[PDB]
DNA sequence: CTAGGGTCCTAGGACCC
DNA sequence: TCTAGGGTCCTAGGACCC
């Protein structure tokens, strides 16, 4: 009975760079760390996507695929300001807004009577207003539940939208690959595949008890989504639970002196961020993370009442001594868990 | 050749009745 | 606690999203 819109900015980071500097519009560009910083692609424009460049791709791999790729470091304040403006635009239509990141959000427009209650037309006018006021484009999905609205906002990217009507949900589900369902990633998909389950169609012919056994709470979400069942309400009141800061070295470190020097560079950053939402720096836990050169990672965290540099250093020394094992370390991170 | 923000779930032992 | 076991907290790790 509800109407959910999922709105999604196209090539968001890249799109802001291209607006601000038009000479980037028709050449392949990407935001991400450089190859020597051991970077990863955050996102790429469509001329770069043509070459196979994707989010989360190692920058070294992107550059082999697209040698003339232009790498930008990214400008958070620019993306943030675009994001605020966009969210303020959503607020013109409803207060039922659940942001999932800078670039996107769910809207529950069930009880709105903008555009004669048309969720299709509301989505259209939001995309138009965003183009008008920010010169960036958005795609949208309109559906009776969250996850279908989110899948839908991809159907007609870029700068388009897609509507899934209650009567259309069954045909839509029947051939929908499980991997397109939010929270079904590569490991899940492959495990499902090895059971003969590829599509929501397949999952409908499956015993619930049995999915509960092999997958726990995940198996129930699976069975529900496959039916088109998604009762999760649009929640406009979510609050951040943690604050973390980490860096990957251009080169693996092998000595503790190097590790402590990195922590001293991280700590002020963790403190400035935490203070932004907790001026008194009071927290529930603090902890450290190490990532080794074989990519295993370990965290050590404990109840602690107030952000403290020396105890983070101390904690990192124990973690360093105990679980490094002569391995090179590629990443150091600090972490706090916020009070409830 | 593998980022940096995060969220949510699982699970053994401690701890408390 | 009335006794074999139930509930909740602490911690580490993993899958996942953007
Ligand atoms: C998936 C992803 C996104 N991001 C950043 C860059 C994207 O511009 C932004 C929004 O994420 P998205 O909506 O997943 N991707 P997009 O907006 O670039 O592309 P699309 O047009 O939505 O397909 O978040 C990363 O920094 N690393 C990532 O792995
Ligand atoms: Mg997007």
Separation, N- and C-terminal Cα atoms? 34 Å
Total number of helices: 13
CATH superfamily of the largest domain: Reverse transcriptase/Diguanylate cyclase domain
CATH top-level class of the largest domain: Alpha Beta
Please state how the strands of the largest beta sheet are arranged side by side. 5-6-1-7-8
Helix content: 40-55%
Major sheet: 5 strands, mixed
Shape: globular
Number of strands: 12
The distinct ligands, each listed once, are: the ligand Cc1cn([C@H]2C[C@H](O)[C@@H](COP(=O)(O)NP(=O)(O)OP(=O)(O)O)O2)c(=O)[nH]c1=O, magnesium ion
CATH topology descriptor of the largest domain: Alpha-Beta Plaits
Rounded to an integer in angstroms, the radius of gyration calculated over CA atoms is 23 Å
The H-and-E topology, N to C, reads as EHEEHHEHEEHEHEHHHHHEHEEHE
Structural class: alpha+beta
CATH architecture of the largest domain: 2-Layer Sandwich
Give the total of domains.
4
How much strand content do the residues show? 15-25%
């Amino acid at each position: 009975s509800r109407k959910i819109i999922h709105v999604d900015m196209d090539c968001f980071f890249a799109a802001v760079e291209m607006r601000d500097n038009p000479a980037l519009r028709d050449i392949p560009i990407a935001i991400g760390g450089s190859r020597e910083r051991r970077g990863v692609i955050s996102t790429a424009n469509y001329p770069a996507r043509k070459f196979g460049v994707r989010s989360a791709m190692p920058t070294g791999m992107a550059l082999k695929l697209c040698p003339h790729l232009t790498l930008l470091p990214g400008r958070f304040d620019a993306y943030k300001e675009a994001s605020n403006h966009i969210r303020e635009i959503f607020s013109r239509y409803t207060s039922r807004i659940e942001p999932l990141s800078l670039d996107e959000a769910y809207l529950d427009v069930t009880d709105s009577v903008h555009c004669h209650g048309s969720a299709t037309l509301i989505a259209q006018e939001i995309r138009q207003t965003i183009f008008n006021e920010l010169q960036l484009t958005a795609s949208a999905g309109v559906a009776p539940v969250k996850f279908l609205a989110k899948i839908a906002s991809d159907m007609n990217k870029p700068n388009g939208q897609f509507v899934i009507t209650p009567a259309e949900v069954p045909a839509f589900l029947q051939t929908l690959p499980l991997a397109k369902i939010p929270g079904v990633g590569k490991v899940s998909a492959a495990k499902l595949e090895a059971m003969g389950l590829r599509t929501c169609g397949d999952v409908q012919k499956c015993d619930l008890v049995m999915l509960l056994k092999r997958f726990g709470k995940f198996g129930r979400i699976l069975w529900e989504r496959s039916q088109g069942i998604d009762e999760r309400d649009v929640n406009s009141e979510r609050l951040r639970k943690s604050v973390g800061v980490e860096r990957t070295m251009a080169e693996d470190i092998h000595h503790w002196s190097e590790c402590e020097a990195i922590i001293e560079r991280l700590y002020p950053e963790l403190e400035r961020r935490l203070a932004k939402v907790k001026p008194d720096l009071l927290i529930a836990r603090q902890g450290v993370k190490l990532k080794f050169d074989d990519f295993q990672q370990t965290t050590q965290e404990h109840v602690w009442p107030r952000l403290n540099k020396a105890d983070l250093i101390a904690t990192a020394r124990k973690t360093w001594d105990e679980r490094r094992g002569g391995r090179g370390v590629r990443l150091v991170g600090l972490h706090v868990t916020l009070l409830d």
